Amino acid sequence: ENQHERAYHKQSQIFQGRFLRKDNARCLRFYKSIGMGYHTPITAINGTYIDKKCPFTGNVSIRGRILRGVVHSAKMQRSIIVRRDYLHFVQKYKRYERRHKHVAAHLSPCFRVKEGDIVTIGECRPLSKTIRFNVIKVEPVSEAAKKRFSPF
Amino acid sequence: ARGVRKHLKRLNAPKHWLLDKMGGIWAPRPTNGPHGLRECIPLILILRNRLHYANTYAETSMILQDKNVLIDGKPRTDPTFPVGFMDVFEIPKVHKTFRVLYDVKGRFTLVPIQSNEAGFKLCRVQKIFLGDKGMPYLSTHDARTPHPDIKTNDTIKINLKTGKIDEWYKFDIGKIVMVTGGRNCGRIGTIQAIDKHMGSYTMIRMKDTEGTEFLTRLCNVFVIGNDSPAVAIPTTKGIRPDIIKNRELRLRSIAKR
Amino acid sequence: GITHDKMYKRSKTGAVQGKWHKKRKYNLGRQPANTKLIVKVTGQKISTIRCRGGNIKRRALRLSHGSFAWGSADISHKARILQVVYNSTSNELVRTNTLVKGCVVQIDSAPFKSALSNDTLDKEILDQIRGDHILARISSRPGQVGTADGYILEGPELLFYQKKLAPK
Amino acid sequence: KSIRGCIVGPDLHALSVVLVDAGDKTLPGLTDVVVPKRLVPKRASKIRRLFGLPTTKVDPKDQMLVCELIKELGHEVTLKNGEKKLKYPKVQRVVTDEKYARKQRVIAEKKEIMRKSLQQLEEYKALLSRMGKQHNIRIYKPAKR
RNA sequence: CAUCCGGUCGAUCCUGCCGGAGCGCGACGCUCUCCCCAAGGACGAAGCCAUGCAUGCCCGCUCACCCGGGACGCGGCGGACGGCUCAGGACAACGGUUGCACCCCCCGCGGCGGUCCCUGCUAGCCGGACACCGCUGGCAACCCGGCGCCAAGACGUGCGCGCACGGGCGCGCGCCCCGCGGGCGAGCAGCGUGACGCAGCGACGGCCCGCCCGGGCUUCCGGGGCAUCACCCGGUCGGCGCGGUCGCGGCGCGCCGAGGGCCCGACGCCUGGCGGAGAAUCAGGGUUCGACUCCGGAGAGCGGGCCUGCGAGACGGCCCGCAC
RNA sequence: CGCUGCUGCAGUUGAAACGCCCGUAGUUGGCCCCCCGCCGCCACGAGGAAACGGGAGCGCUCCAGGCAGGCCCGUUGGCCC
Chain A, 2-41: which CBs lie within 7 Å of strand E? Predict the structure, then answer.
């Protein structure tokens, strides 16, 4: 409850009218376990976050390529920048040149994310202009583990 | 790009049709229908070029303009109507019956069959759809559209007479299976194994009769009899003749020539 | 000439993109048909627009009335439809009385007044049923589908929304 | 396309004008000869009221015709001048008993294909429902185990 | 598929580049006895065009004609395919790889096939309403007028079974999670339940479904030069509520924040920049070139804007601004 | 033409080590744990048009050609890219 938020948010998948009674057939959130062996997080099961873009508790369905990368930026609300380190082989000189590709990922409040951590992203129908990827798992690291160009 | 293309160039044409590069700017184009464009061969070529019955492309249209040729027991006359895999094609004027099969190199071959062989048709089961007002339905490799205990990939022996399910060849390890697509088309072997990977492109491992474990994609796999071919196999039994075994055959052919 | 083509948008790096093509028919956009609440009905003109592949869409431009449902008692009835109260995106749209899904509206209680006789059927809809107007939000895309059905507001959306508009 | 304005002006090279109510003193050219109307009605519904049969309404009248009779005027191609080929509009909107049979054939066919489908659904309904209970006959054994 | 020689001095040995030596592919000069095969107005002018041609095919109706010979118009299908050329376009196009649980798709192929009405019905199956064609006329031309009449497997209307039914609804699985299907790797489907609409097609049943053939986009990696371009962008970057679209999306709009990019070269600028399949030259590695055959793009003097259609933002369609 | 140098060029004096030093990116980092986890890496598949390059078979009278031909692999036109 607030006076500043302009529009009320709920889950289309849940029913607001249902919450008024019948404390038996009652469900807090319409969350479903993701496929590709993805465990639904417990914070997500017991989570009061509307998140229409949540992979676990929202309309978003994960289908397509699933990648793993580091956390570069997280200034955006409900969005993080995933730096994807990778190597490019040159044939004229048999050496590899290091490259970096930043990818935008929508993050659910169930994921608590800090910079220097490593996230496992997954493909989504484009959520925004730069976001076609959603986070399905977040792995933290102690403090800042330097960088070290890791193509995860 | 504007609208649908209605031409197929000769260089664009798939290699299996084996249409000569010169002598023709463009090959014939199949019609949208039971089989796909690279999954089917043209009916005109099967009579005009493969059998040499029609001297010109137009005079193949003349032959079926008056009904004279049938595919899957139905007149199916159109000249460029797609004629694809396990098709019962019969010329009643010639009094001959031919299943359209895949050769070991991979090209299509018309192989003569018995009237009992003409009695049934083999088609793979595509994924069951739940449409048409909740009536369960499933499609074939020939697009034809049920029995509840059936899954995708299994082959139904549609009669073409009953137009109904008959002997269903369930997809399980050890069934004698044909390969529809990939480099080793035409080869026949029991499926040694399957690795799904719970993602896509399930791996297929196939032990052949001679102990060579050939492989392909799981979609390109055709069942040919739950037990035994249950079809008229062209005399190669999918043995995969090698390039040298093919040179032997060619050199004896030249000796006979 | 309206288009949703991405060519006319700048890149993530704020960079101008070379225009490789003239606007194409597939990426076309059409004028927003603003469904307009008739208010007193003392006309529902719903247009029909040709789409891609010879399909059809119904464009509501002026209409009153429409199916509504009381989810708590699960009874569904047509309702007269009164003025739009709240638009959640604009305060002008409410006064203009344009109809779009998510716009909360008042409805006559006379069809759904049959539940005043019943008791303990919630309390909020009981007081709206007693009153001339019922708080309800639209659940249908009036412009694309051509109908403006809705659900009578029940429980938390109604609690937050009442606080948002009614008190002064 | 350029168009002249509907209100007439002296400028127009020509105009066109049609009698709405005819006056007296009939004109030598404008009012006197009714150009023979041709193109005789082909519609059966038109024929029913045109040939004194409107009262018959739905009826097997079959053949009533008024026709031009000056040979055919194309008998020079036949090369026989002395012939009188009928000059008639082919009847339109004609109803035949084959038309009635065609309606009955397709109505029987529509009913037949619909009926076969209805009975078949009940047969499949048994297969699925019995199969779920038949699966129960199997699930008995693990509980015994 | 690994090769040099001539040129700095009085001579010498070096470095160093000059010139030869072979090939390709265009001009250019001189000459060519044939036969075969064969590129051909791309090359800083996607400049401009006289002339003729490049998309018709059939009747669904035939009352003229005149024996089904059958024009003329309407009617159906095709005219978006095909041919042409690389102007534009430098995280784009194009290629491999993906996704549509974010979708559209005529023909054809294999199937389903209850269509409410109050009623109003002619449903042994209906209307009115026009071309054509007469009959008078304009205009220098182009182009059309009015009159009168009659057709269609044209069009408009119309019975038709409440598992009537297109749509869009409101409501219908869950107990930390993870393992059976009509299913899938995954809450996807298809309905039951309560409303609304009266959509189609129906005057010779198709409503509709799938397969498929293409699209529409999308994932990942590849994807010119320039620092005498070091800082950029401001719907730009996220979120939210709507619209809009075949559909996802700043795709448009309000609202709310403060992002998003960069010495692993961003942004800016330039390009006598189509891209790849490929081509030329060649030990190996490289280098060089991608007009044209195949594919994918993009355009039809230049900008826009459009209806028809199953599909074109079409130019051998239309409309307008700008040239000529 | 190893006169562009990854293979594979030179900088004392022929052209050329910044006058010197700290220094951030960048690049490079002694050994050392066998035994898995992600890397990269390497091999092996699968799937994704040909023409084209190669190449089997073949007397266009020879050839550049072409996928033809012959009393026939189920005649061929494989197979690789």
Answer: 6-7, 9, 13-15, 17-18, 24-27, 29-40
**What is the span of the domain harbouring residue C59?**
30-168
Among B134, B168, B202, the domain boundary falls at: B168
C-alpha span between D93 and B78 (Å, rounded)? 35
Chain A residue at shortest CA distance from C69? A17
Nearest partner of B177 among B197, B192, B165, judged by Cα: B192
Residue B145, amino acid:
T
CB of B238 nearer than 7 A to strand F = no
Rounded to the nearest angstrom, the gap between the alpha carbon of residue D65 and the centroid of all alpha carbons in its chain is: 19
Amino acid at D143: A
User: Contact partners of C by the rule of 3+ C-beta pairs under 8 A?
Assistant: A
Same domain (yes/no): B98, B139? no
| Entry resolution (Å) | 3.2
A147 CA – E270 C1', rounded, Å: 37
Place of tokens 């529009």: A7
Distance from C-alpha of C121 to C-alpha of D71, rounded to nearest angstrom: 89
> Both B86 and B29 in a single domain?
yes
- When divided into structural domains, chain C yields a total of 1
Residue B232 sits in the same domain as residue B214: yes
The strand order across the sheet containing C45-50 reads: C45-50, C56-63, C35-37, C98-99
| Kind of pairing between the strands at A133-139 and A96-106 | parallel
Separation of alpha carbons B172 and B175, rounded Å: 6
| Strand E within 7 A of C61 CB | no
Let me know if residue B248 belongs to a domain: no
The total of other beta-carbon atoms located within 10 Å of residue A82's CB is: 25
Q: Chain F positions under 7 Å from a protein CB?
A: 6, 26-27, 38-41, 45-52, 56-58, 66-80
At residue A122, the 3 state secondary structure works out as: strand
Burial of B7 (0-12, 13-18, 19+ CB in 10 A): exposed
A101 three-state secondary structure:
strand
Asked if residue B217 is part of any domain, the answer here is yes
Separation in Å, CA of B130 to nearest CA in chain A = 21
- Nucleotide E199 C1' to residue B226 CA (A): 48
- Cβ atoms of A102 and A84 closer than 8 Å: yes
Complete DSSP assignment for chain C: --B--GGGS--TT-------S---STTB------EEE-SS----EEEEEE-GGG-EEEEEEEE--EEEEETTTTEEEEE----B---SS-SHHHHHTEE-TT-EEEEESTGGGGGSSS-SS-SHHHHHHHSSEEEEEE-S-HHHHS---EEE--THHHHHHHHHHS--
By residue range, what is the domain housing residue B200? Answer: 171-240
CA-CA distance, A129 to C166, in Å (whole number)? 37
Flag whether B14 is in a domain: yes
Q: How was this structure determined?
A: cryo-EM
